[PDB]
């Protein structure tokens, strides 16, 4: 049986925050087991070589399967604080653990008495003890190098461990790494300097990490993934413990603990503050039969001129579609989804690579080239097709999977979202049926609750199969198996996603005009919804009339500046 | 002989014909009693019991006998009788017998106790309520009451009811008054040239008017015990404290409000609402955002110039606009835009008249097709048309033009961008016999060529609000109804762009008043930063930039919907309407 470890990841670098954490995740999963749950990233109050690291890292002596999983019996057992495996390392009693914990916390309090980006993860580990895991985590750190990256073990199974005075020499360390890693012995590549001094970075071991119930940041992350867990060291479960921290703090100091401590999501390479902006997603139908667009952008050169336009016009994201999903549509049978889309993506990249070479020949050469890729519009593909999406992430042609129907069409597409070092974010929309039948499928016992419940289960599936929680965006699918009164109701109750990253697509849909040559009327109705969306703090809105949506939000933003 | 100050309370049950009924009653009242020098809002109140045909009204106005007295219609700036009244000091000695405060209270509480009993045994509508201050030439409260009974009868749910709430500082209770026709005649004919002819008289009324007067009671029995009365008087005499009152009006209103909420635990304001009036009907304050459609009939307007000079086009445009959702249309003959020089070859008046008259000519052809058997009965069909007709506001500061407009029944609202300061005389034109007119007081400084230079305020938000409130006090003193006076902060007029924005930011200070805004196509919008077509946009100016200016427009339109602005004034009616519909839908 596999063990369960819960880890904590820390950095101080905001600029590079994602690349550092995700690189540290890649390597953890590699040398330790599958990552089967994760928190969001959290901003809390107390790299030009990183790519080169990946094809030089040493392989693991354990290979886990790439297969999708739907369950994890060990996780279910961890969570009940029940026994999975005899502890190799000596356990201690709760009373001795809390004595020797509380001593280290008062001493640490004394020394210090003279932002952080965070993440919890759950690992289904093939490592047999805590100590070994710890030695492996130190290795990964040094391979990179509390500034840079910090990985701590919070819970390893249900064990209560406390070991002072651990001294490990270059022999001990070697014996432990090479039980788990194929280490390179060769002169022209090795890390045997590192392995030799890795005992200097370990003086003691202690599960649970004993700041676990005493640090908001930790509780805050653990609250996303193991709210019901109650280690024996704890007097109440993580969510109850969280709640007794927030409450006490807001009672004692009467400031909102939420104010400085913020949830973050990621789209591409940088962190976003959840709910703190409404980005624009420019639409680009590259096909012969979309309502409102068909055929305008089939030619790759008109389709690329247009991307460049919306980018300029204000859109943060661009969302390519090769095939309509609109009511009673019959996709153009003369050219496929893939044939339409590939040239246009491929043309975009080549056009951006001419841009980058024309710039290549602040104010320096890197200063100039960093301003160019620092405004590259994010590219989001609107498909459900394994083989096309594969071809996009293999050629470096997209950043975001927009799977309408939440990766239920072919769940295997989920495995392409993590590619080695490279992660990719995903939009899970709600919908039923297909274009001819969706209208007819509108019975819900509890429209609002049911749909939230649908998306939440899809999320649990994706995080369990190793997609980071902070890359998953929701969408209620306005117009997709809703009547117009239902579509409007979903907007009315949009406050139920107030804890989640949220993406909406109203643009040009029929329900808009149901509120009232009259394309004019529908676009304007849209701009209203954009205001509503602004005030509801929707995270991303997906629209065709970028220039005009921009105008709205500029005005709305200005009015609401202190 | 100084004049007396009386405070009257008007009350009706008929919501559809509400405005006409009260404004008919204010006309007769001013005519026979004095000058109206102050007024409250109208309020929709829930009846306090326990402590629709008017097609004859118009033809009553010119047939009413004259007052023997006559006030000068000159503008006034003060009323000493009032000042005095407000300190509960004496004006004139009471002809009628006064009574001690303790005897007064005793007799009142019997009348109230007995009314409660009546109504307890008993057990349909709301009450629309207005209060008014009159500087009066009637020498005593009884004679006034007789003139009020006369007025009511001249008209006759309870259709109209007019009571004397205060008459000077007097404290009076006459328990059983008995006036025969002779007595009534003596009293009315001292103040009115009554017709004496067989084919024209009201001697059947005058003779029996006594039946309608059983006692006399100043202050009114219920003055301090009805929210609806306190609610009104809080507008007009808040600081007053009679001898019967343990504290002033405002203190007493807040006492009432706390007591209510600290008992029945509901908000008293939720079910008693402030109304305002644009033309012929009540509008519930803050309950809606209406769209005002801009019509510039001149060669020099910053975005419309030269499009609507031809009357036929300009009149089509007014039909398009009403169709597209505009509740009011605002015709403007001269431009006030920055640095503009108005075309000196044709006059504001020349431009606006052929239009306003054509439109009337046209609308009347509509009614005649409908009536005829083209385009609910006859009465039904024809009522619908008139309810459909757009309100007309005229944007000018010219006495001679507004005189002409009003004289021909061509407009319904003065939109005076100078807050009626260019020519204060224009105020006397807001009230013409039976017919009253609503007015929009906007804040500007300077003129199109100097406004931009006049942007030093000590306190922008509060200075503009003071100004507007002073302009309101001046109009209400000169007899314009407060429910017809609308505020506008004047965006872009003698404000820097940051200052226009700021005014929007603190627009909540107008949370108590009717509010009119015009952001449309102004400069400050763009300072913040299946196809879209602008319409009714000069081909001369920046096409791409005004796409952005118009759509920023729509953002304020949304913002305005949320802040509860009463009227927005826009070029893009179709679009603004689209936004308002959707937002409306989302919020049911
Ligand atoms: N201002 C006033 N002061 C004293 N008595 C008054 C008065 N106005 C009316 N009355 C008296 O009130 C009696 C009933 O007349 P109405 O005014 O019709 C009662 P109402 O209208 O049902 O109640 P309300 O006056 O409280 O609105 C008459 O005998 C009349 O003399
Ligand atoms: N996440 C998400 N993606 C979407 N993609 C397409 C459309 C339909 O819009 P459009 O692209 O204009 O039409 P077509 O499907 O015909 O391309 N709607 C959504 C949506 O609501 N949510
Ligand atoms: N009450 C009020 N009336 C107004 N009239 C005209 C203009 C200017 O707009 P427009 O008519 O388009 O320009 P011009 O004055 O050049 O006709 N602004 C206002 C305003 O803000 N408030
Ligand atoms: C930098 C210091 O942090 C300690 N450290 C890191 N993670 C853990 C854990 N889960 N338990 C105990 N100690 C830990 C190392 O032992 C080192 O001494
Ligand atoms: N609120 C209210 N109450 C009343 N009670 C009796 C008579 N009139 C009225 C009236 O006009 N309004
Ligand atoms: N793909 C879609 C396109 C349009 C609509 C809609 O108009 O309701 C719904 C789905
Ligand atoms: N009448 C006016 C027209 C325009 C502006 C403005 O754009 O600032 C101000 C006043
Ligand atoms: Mg004008």
- Residues B130, B40 contacting (CB under 8 angstroms): yes
Residues in chain B: 588
Ramachandran angles phi, psi of B275, nearest 5°: -110, 160
What is the rounded CA–CA span in Å between residue B392 and residue B227?
35
What is the rounded CA–CA span in Å between residue B484 and residue B11?
18
Residues 6+ apart with CB under 8 A from A531: A552, A556, B554, B555, B558, B559, B579, B583
Chain A residues inside the 8 Å CB shell of B581: 515-516, 525
Closest approach of chain B CAs to the CA of A557, in angstroms? 8
Sign for the pseudo-dihedral over CA of B82, B88, B93, B97: positive
Q: Which ligand is nearest to the CA of B415?
A: 3
Instruction: Quickly count: other Cβ atoms within 10 Å of residue B559's Cβ.
Output: 23
What is the rounded CA–CA span in Å between residue B271 and residue B46?
7
What is the rounded CA–CA span in Å between residue B501 and residue B510?
15
CB of B520 shorter than 6 A to ligand 7: no
Tokens of B294: 């801009």
Cα–Cα nearest to A180, from A122, A123, A127: A127
Tokens of B256: 């009432």
Find where tokens 């950095």 sit: A11
What is the rounded CA–CA span in Å between residue A226 and residue B265?
43
Between β-strands B413-416 and B391-395, what pairing exists: parallel, antiparallel or unpaired?
A: parallel
Residues 6+ apart with CB under 8 A from A28: A7, A35, A121, A123, A137, A140, A151
Number of H helices, E strands in chain B: 17, 19
Instruction: Tell me the C-alpha to C-alpha distance, in Å, between residue A190 and each of A107, A171, A182, A187, A193.
Output: 38, 16, 11, 7, 8
- Residues B222, B112 contacting (CB under 8 angstroms): yes
Between β-strands A279-285 and A271-273, what pairing exists: parallel, antiparallel or unpaired?
A: unpaired
Between β-strands B391-395 and A503-504, what pairing exists: parallel, antiparallel or unpaired?
A: unpaired
Select from A532, A544, A551 the Cβ nearest to the Cβ of B548: A551
Question: Are B532 and A520 inside 8 Å of each other by CB?
Answer: yes
The alpha carbon of residue A417 and the mean position of all alpha carbons in its chain are separated, in whole angstroms, by 10
What is the rounded CA–CA span in Å between residue A64 and residue B573?
64
Residues 23-82 of A with CB under 8 A from B: none
A488 reaches B (C-beta below 8 A): yes
What is the 3-class SS of A305-341, one letter each residue? Answer: HHHHHHHHHCCCEEEEECCCCCCCCCCCCCCCHHHHH
What is the rounded CA–CA span in Å between residue A41 and residue A263?
6
SS3 A265: strand
- Residues B68, B192 contacting (CB under 8 angstroms): yes
What is the rounded CA–CA span in Å between residue B203 and residue B192?
13
What is the rounded CA–CA span in Å between residue A561 and residue A467?
36
SS3 B331: strand
Q: How was this structure determined?
A: X-ray
Residue B74 DSSP label:
-
Instruction: Quickly count: other Cβ atoms within 10 Å of residue B248's Cβ.
Output: 16
Residues 6+ apart with CB under 8 A from A394: none
With CA atoms as reference, the chain A residue closest to B573 would be A521
CB of A205 shorter than 6 A to ligand 4: yes
Cα–Cα nearest to A60, from A163, A223, A239, A182: A182
CB of B127 shorter than 6 A to ligand 5: yes
Tokens of A298: 């089939």
What is the rounded CA–CA span in Å between residue A453 and residue B283?
44
Beta bridge partners of B291: B568
- Residues A454, A474 contacting (CB under 8 angstroms): no
Q: Which ligand is nearest to the CA of B8?
A: 1
Please tell me the residue having the least CA distance from ligand 3 atom 20: B518
Within 6 A (CB) of ligand 2 lie A 283, 285, 290-293, 321, 324-326, 382, 402, 404, 427, 429, 475, 477-478, 503, 505, 508, 542
What is the rounded CA–CA span in Å between residue B175 and residue B110?
11
What is the residue-wise DSSP string for A78-128?
HTTT--SS--SSPP--HHHHHHHHHHHHHHHHHHH---EEEEEEEEEE--S
Residues 6+ apart with CB under 8 A from B13: B125, B126, B127, B128, B157, B158, B159
What is the rounded CA–CA span in Å between residue B47 and residue B127?
6
Q: Is the peptide bond before B219 cis (omega within 30 degrees of 0)?
A: yes
Instruction: Tell me the C-alpha to C-alpha distance, in Å, between residue A239 and each of A210, B17, B100.
Output: 17, 62, 71
What is the rounded CA–CA span in Å between residue B349 and residue B68?
39
Residue A205 DSSP label:
E
Between β-strands B435-436 and B431-432, what pairing exists: parallel, antiparallel or unpaired?
A: antiparallel
B263 reaches A (C-beta below 8 A): no
Between β-strands B485-488 and B438-442, what pairing exists: parallel, antiparallel or unpaired?
A: parallel
B574 reaches A (C-beta below 8 A): yes
Tell me the structure's resolution in angstroms, rounded to a single decimal: 2.9
Query: How far, in Å, from the CA of A202 to the mean position of ligand 4?
Result: 7
Closest approach of chain A CAs to the CA of B446, in angstroms? 26
Burial classification of residue A269, based on how many CB atoms lie within 10 Å of its CB (0-12 exposed, 13-18 middle, 19 or more buried)? middle
Instruction: Quickly count: other Cβ atoms within 10 Å of residue B63's Cβ.
Output: 9
């Amino acid at each position: 049986p596999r063990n369960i470890a819960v880890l904590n990841f820390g950095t101080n670098d905001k600029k590079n925050c994602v690349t550092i954490l995700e690189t540290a995740l890649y390597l953890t999963e590699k040398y330790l087991g599958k990552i089967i749950n994760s928190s969001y990233i959290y901003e809390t109050v107390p790299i030009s070589w990183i790519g080169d690291l990946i094809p030089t890292v040493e392989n693991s002596r354990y290979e886990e399967s790439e297969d999708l999983i739907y369950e994890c019996k060990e996780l279910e057992v961890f969570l009940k604080n029940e026994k999975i495996n005899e502890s190799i390392i000596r356990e201690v009693s709760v009373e001795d653990y809390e004595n020797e914990a509380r001593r280290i916390i008062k001493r640490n309090d004394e020394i210090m008495k003279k932002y952080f980006f965070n993440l919890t993860v759950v690992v289904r580990t093939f490592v047999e003890d805590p100590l070994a895991m710890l030695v492996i985590l130190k290795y990964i750190e040094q391979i990179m190098k509390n500034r840079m990256i910090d990985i701590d073990i919070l819970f390893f199974n249900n064990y209560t461990i406390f070991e002072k005075s651990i001294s490990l020499k270059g022999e001990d360390i070697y014996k432990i790494i090479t039980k788990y890693i194929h280490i390179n012995h060769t002169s022209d590549q090795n890390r045997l300097d590192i392995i030799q001094n890795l005992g200097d970075k370990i003086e003691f071991l202690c599960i649970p990490h004993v700041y676990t119930k005493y640090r908001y940041s930790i509780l805050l992350c653990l609250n996303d993934i193991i709210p019901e867990y109650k280690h024996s060291t704890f007097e109440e479960a993580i969510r109850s413990t969280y709640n007794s921290y927030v409450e006490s703090f807001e009672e004692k100091y009467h400031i909102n603990i939420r104010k400085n401590n913020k949830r973050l999501y990621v789209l591409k390479d940088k962190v976003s503050y959840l709910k703190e902006r409404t980005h624009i997603v420019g639409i680009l139908n590259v096909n012969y039969d979309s309502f409102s667009d068909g055929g305008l952008f089939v030619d790759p050169v008109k389709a690329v001129e247009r991307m460049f336009e919306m980018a300029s016009d204000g859109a943060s994201v661009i969302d390519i579609g090769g095939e309509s999903s609109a009511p009673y549509v019959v996709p153009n049978p003369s050219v496929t989804e893939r044939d339409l889309v590939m040239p246009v993506l491929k043309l975009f990249k080549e056009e951006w690579h001419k841009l980058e070479c024309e710039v290549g020949g602040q104010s320096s050469l890197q200063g100039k080239l960093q301003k160019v890729r620092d405004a590259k519009p994010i590219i989001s593909i609107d498909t459900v097709n394994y083989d096309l999406f594969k071809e996009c992430v293999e050629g470096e042609l997209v950043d975001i999977l927009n799977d309408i129907s939440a990766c239920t069409h072919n769940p295997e597409i989920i495995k392409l979202l993590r590619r080695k070092n490279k992660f990719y974010s995903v939009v899970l929309m709600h919908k039923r049926g297909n274009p001819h039948t969706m209208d007819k499928l509108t019975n819900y016992d509890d429209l609002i609750s049911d749909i939230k419940r649908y998306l939440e289960d899809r999320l649990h599936f994706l995080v369990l199969n190793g997609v980071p929680r902070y890359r998953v965006l929701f969408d209620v699918g306005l117009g997709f198996a809703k009547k117009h009164d239902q579509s409007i109701k979903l907007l009315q109750h949009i406050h139920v996603y107030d804890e989640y990253p949220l993406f909406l697509g109203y643009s040009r849909k029929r329900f808009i005009v149901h509120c009232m040559l009259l394309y004019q009327k529908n676009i304007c109705g849209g701009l209203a919804i954009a205001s509503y969306s602004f005030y509801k703090k929707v995270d991303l809105i997906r629209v065709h009339d970028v220039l005009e949506t921009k105008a709205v939000l500029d005005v709305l933003t200005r009015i609401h500046q202190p």
